[PDB]
């Protein structure tokens, strides 16, 4: 279930700044400074980057119309 392309409260795009976000959190860098380094200001933008599942990998492979 790929990342939502808007937030749910603050209308602002987010799906361009998720796959750049996650490849810099599996190096050990703290997420409190990674999300601040990008353009995320409030905490209504930020509760929907910091908690997500991206489960599209499992469902895709089964292959059925």
């Amino acid at each position: 279930m790929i990342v939502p392309v808007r937030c749910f409260t603050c209308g602002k795009v987010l799906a361009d700044k998720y796959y750049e976000f996650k490849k810099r959190v599996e190096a050990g860098e703290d997420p409190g400074k990674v999300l601040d380094d990008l353009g995320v200001e409030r905490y209504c933008c930020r509760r929907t980057l910091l908690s997500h599942v991206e489960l599209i990998d499992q469902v895709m492979v089964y292959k059925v119309y």
Partner: peptide, 25 residues
């Protein structure tokens, strides 16, 4: 809630699916 990955290839009498589930805080 999205409980299992095989909801597509499955025949159960009624199922549910929620498009954007979230890991809780």
């Amino acid at each position: 809630g999205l409980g299992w990955a095989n909801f597509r290839i499955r025949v159960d009498t009624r199922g549910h699916l929620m498009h954007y589930p979230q890991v809780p805080l």
